[PDB]
From Swiss-Prot, chains A, B, C, D, E:
<feature type="domain" description="SAM">
    <location>
        <begin position="5"/>
        <end position="69"/>
    </location>
</feature>
<comment type="subunit">
    <text>Homopolymerize into a closed pentameric ring. Interacts (via SAM domain) with L3MBTL3 (via SAM domain); the interaction mediates L3MBTL3 binding to chromatin. Interacts (via WH domain) with KDM1A; the interaction modulates KDM1A function.</text>
</comment>
<comment type="function">
    <text>Unmethylated CpG islands (CGIs)-binding protein which localizes to H3K4me3-decorated CGIs, where it acts as a transcriptional repressor. Tethers L3MBTL3 to chromatin and interacts with the KDM1A histone demethylase complex to modulate H3K4me2 and H3K4me3 levels at CGIs. Plays a role in atherogenesis by binding with LDL on cell surface and promoting LDL oxidation which leads to the formation of foam cell.</text>
</comment>
<protein>
    <recommendedName>
        <fullName>Sterile alpha motif domain-containing protein 1</fullName>
    </recommendedName>
</protein>
Length: 69, 69, 69, 69, 69
């Protein structure tokens, strides 16, 4: 079902996961669930224009978790 | 055949494929079919100045598909 | 343990370590101890906007050491 | 042999090779024949500030060919 | 002994090696001998804000040589 998430679904997920400031970057880059499942580490860390601290946790604890589950 | 595509052909491909806003980047970077078949992942995600969501699908389901065909 | 360090704990650590000018970058990027243990080499050298000389020592003699201890 | 080419020699080569617009970037970056033989793929695609399309051909059909000869 | 070099020692080295314009970047990035021995290729090519041609020689013929000697 993550593969079916809209951009707004992705924004809502990261808002509810505790990254409401960084969630808007997924809207800015038009990242839906299908694109989310295609992202690699450098895409999150350097491609979203977000601070490195949250970016590291967004990838390792959510994007990577989503791609593996 | 992609290898013979002009820059106009590459722009038309991504427009017809549903990326009309991103197709502009292929004109800006003067990417013909021969250059298209040389592109790697980071060239699409960071070399076109396009949004990451569309860039991820452009590489995975189009540039990669054309190169493997 | 480092995994529980706050952002201000991280800034304090690098201040005591002799990088007080670079310590502000960890505050800027909101890097706590959990984020610190997720960092890779390029994150320190290109993601903190600090000088390269201090960045190389910060990674080799502190971040690496903390991740390996 | 290319290893002896001056910066101007490199500029004239790419001018004669059909990349006159991109040839000035080798003057800007002060790339002589010895530097040319040290370049890797990302150096051409991101280090010359040239368009991606021409840069891909410049690496694949010229710089790589000179390094492998 | 290279590991004991100060920042200006490094600046002096690259000036005498024939890179006086690029030697200033080692002062700007506060790179002493200890930091010089930690540098990798991409640090020289993208982290010093120097022209690519000289940067390629600086890494291959000097920084790599010092690290291996």
């Amino acid at each position: 079902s993550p593969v079916e998430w809209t951009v707004m679904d992705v924004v809502e997920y990261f808002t509810e996961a505790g990254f409401p400031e960084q969630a808007t970057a997924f809207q800015e880059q038009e990242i839906d669930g299908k694109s989310l499942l295609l992202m690699q580490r450098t895409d999150v860390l350097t491609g979203l224009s977000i601070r490195l601290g949250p970016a590291l946790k967004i990838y390792e604890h959510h994007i990577k978790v989503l791609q593996q589950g």
